[PDB]
């Protein structure tokens, strides 16, 4: 499902289809909340990467700020966990978002 959403997201970005982007962003945010609440942090980071791109494209600063907040929560958890690639990824995503939120 997520591979197809990414494909559709990029098709829409490339073609200027802002309505599709906004729809996909809404779906990603729902998927993100579910992954986060299940403690599936690798999946949450992954979804968040995509959501950040979609929210950036449509200029949705409020969503970017929400994504920064959830990423910071993920970081707080992973600081304690010893999965270095996941911790580095959440931190990398935070630095990218901080440019736009």
């Amino acid at each position: 499902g997520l591979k197809e959403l990414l494909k559709e997201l990029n098709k829409a970005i490339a073609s200027g289809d802002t309505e599709t982007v906004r729809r996909i962003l809404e779906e990603l945010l729902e998927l993100l909340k579910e992954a986060f609440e299940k403690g599936d942090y690798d999946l949450a980071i992954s979804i968040a990467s995509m959501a950040v791109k979609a929210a950036s494209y449509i200029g949705d600063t409020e969503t970017l700020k929400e994504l920064l907040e959830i990423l910071k929560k993920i970081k707080e958890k992973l600081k304690k966990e010893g999965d270095e690639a996941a911790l580095k990824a959440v931190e990398r995503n935070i630095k990218v978002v901080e440019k736009v939120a």
């Binding site: 591979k3 690798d42 980071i45 791109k53 494209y57 580095k88 990824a89 995503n93 630095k95 990218v96």
Partner: protein, 111 residues
């Protein structure tokens, strides 16, 4: 200002990829790259029976494992062999999102 690539970024992981035309990375972490110029990279290594797959972002201005990135502009991760004593080593770089999730050793052809 360019939004960075999204790449698989699990660093070095054990892998089951062997004797296959293509492999999925089985990396559960898609990260945004830090820097806009970075591309996705996959490195497949087999030393005796130990197979690893490395997934990262990397700036193609720089070598990686002391090799120059080839056709980093391609959207697809086309694996190519490098000379490395004592092991089999293949690498690819690519510039489309999650492109280092789909590692290509050979294509399928309609005949």
């Amino acid at each position: 200002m360019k939004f960075p690539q999204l790449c698989k970024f699990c660093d070095v992981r054990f892998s089951t990829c062997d004797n296959q035309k293509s492999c999925m990375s089985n990396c559960s972490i898609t990260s945004i790259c830090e820097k806009p110029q970075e591309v996705c990279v996959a490195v497949w290594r087999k030393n005796d029976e130990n197979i690893t797959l490395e997934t990262v972002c990397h700036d193609p201005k720089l070598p990686y494992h002391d090799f120059i990135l080839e056709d980093a502009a391609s959207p697809k991760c086309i694996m190519k062999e490098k000379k490395k004593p004592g092991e089999t080593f293949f690498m690819c770089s690519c510039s489309s999102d999650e492109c280092n999730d789909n590692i290509i050793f050979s294509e399928e052809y309609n005949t």
